[PDB]
């Protein structure tokens, strides 16, 4: 009942910003370029210093011409529109957004603790209580996002940052979409795709619950439930209706994962009449105090070593490329609302 009340007020706040988005809140000249944190299909993320405050931020840079070539215009507009409107403890904050002749810029809070991905690969795997701690934060985040009619569509350890208190922040809203009915875009990461996406069906928020099953399995095993050298071989594994669990997985963990990694939509947890409560009330989460997680009162199982607000030791090294700004405006009409 308090969840319904909290979400009702959360929806009112969201809808005001969704209907009247913040636009052009900074300029490139207000930032000092420090280091490239990463490059991917998401363009590039740069560590920057905001000169007026001395604050460090992670600046996502997208080339307008490349977005157009990749047919990602609508997805990029969704990303910025959604990010500027949301407000949740486990979501990365969009601090500023702007564009120039060549690029789009999204300035986000910087998490020097780095991606869950890097820590997970290095350590190998997380114990069940450690994995449960992160999984509970995802459960609350999807409960929040789904109540706003938002589908996330890109859950993976690469998209989960570890904050200075050991809690997570979901980043990368590149495929996030506000949709009341079903949708059809083939998007996401091969290992995390629900069978309904692979089989070109209309799908809904249940794909995020399947992706949660893949994440929990990956955190607890150290490898994903479906892996192979090529995406096609991964797709065949996903649709086969077969999953194998390590012998160290508890009975409760296996039961929860068979209900999340469920090919049948009428049977998938998160998608039934009781919605998110089928997950929250599962035996694997019996020790989880949901309010205490939300309030960040639970002691985190792992805290990244603090080496300063601008330290990059948790990120890999990338070739440093220029930020070129053409003298001519590119794709003006396409990115008018950004």
């Amino acid at each position: 009942e308090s969840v319904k009340e909290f979400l009702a007020k959360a929806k009112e706040d969201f809808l005001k910003k969704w209907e009247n988005p913040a636009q052009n809140t900074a300029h490139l000249d207000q930032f000092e370029r420090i280091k490239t944190l990463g490059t991917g299909s998401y363009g590039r993320v740069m560590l920057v210093k905001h000169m007026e405050t001395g604050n460090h931020y992670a600046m996502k840079i997208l080339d307008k011409q490349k977005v157009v070539k990749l047919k990602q215009i609508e997805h990029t507009l969704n990303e910025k529109r959604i990010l500027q409107a949301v407000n949740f403890p486990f979501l990365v904050k969009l601090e500023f957004s702007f564009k120039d002749n060549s690029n789009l810029y999204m300035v986000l809070e910087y998490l020097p603790g780095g991606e869950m991905f890097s820590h997970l690969r290095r350590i190998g795997r997380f114990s069940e209580p450690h994995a449960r701690f992160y999984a509970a934060q995802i459960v609350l985040t999807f409960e929040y996002l789904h109540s706003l009619d938002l589908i996330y569509r890109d859950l993976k350890p690469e998209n989960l940052m570890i904050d200075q208190q050991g809690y997570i922040k979901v980043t990368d809203f590149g495929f996030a979409k506000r949709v009341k009915g079903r949708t059809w875009t083939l998007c996401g990461t091969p290992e995390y795709l629900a069978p309904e996406i692979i089989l070109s069906k209309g799908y809904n928020k249940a794909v995020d619950w399947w992706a949660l099953g893949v994440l929990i399995y990956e955190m607890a095993a150290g490898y994903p439930p479906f892996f192979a050298d090529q995406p096609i071989q991964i797709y065949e594994k996903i649709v086969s209706g077969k999953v194998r669990f390590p012998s160290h997985f508890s009975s409760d963990l296996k039961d929860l994962l068979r209900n999340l990694l469920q090919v049948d939509l009428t049977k998938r947890f998160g998608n039934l009449k009781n919605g998110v409560n089928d997950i929250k009330n599962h035996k694997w989460f019996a020790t989880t105090d949901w309010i205490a997680i939300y309030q960040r009162k639970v002691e985190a199982p792992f805290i990244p070593k603090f080496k300063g607000p601008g330290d990059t030791s948790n990120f890999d090294d990338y070739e440093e490329e220029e930020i070129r700004v053409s003298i001519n405006e590119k794709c003006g009409k396409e990115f008018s609302e950004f």
């Binding site: 890109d154 993976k156 690469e158 091969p190 095993a221 892996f227 192979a228």
Partner: peptide, 19 residues
């Protein structure tokens, strides 16, 4: 072991999104 199979695979690094 499955761990050894994963480690020897080409997909242990950061995975790119598809569209």
């Amino acid at each position: 072991t499955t761990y050894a199979d994963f480690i020897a695979s080409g997909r242990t690094g950061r995975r790119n999104a598809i569209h």
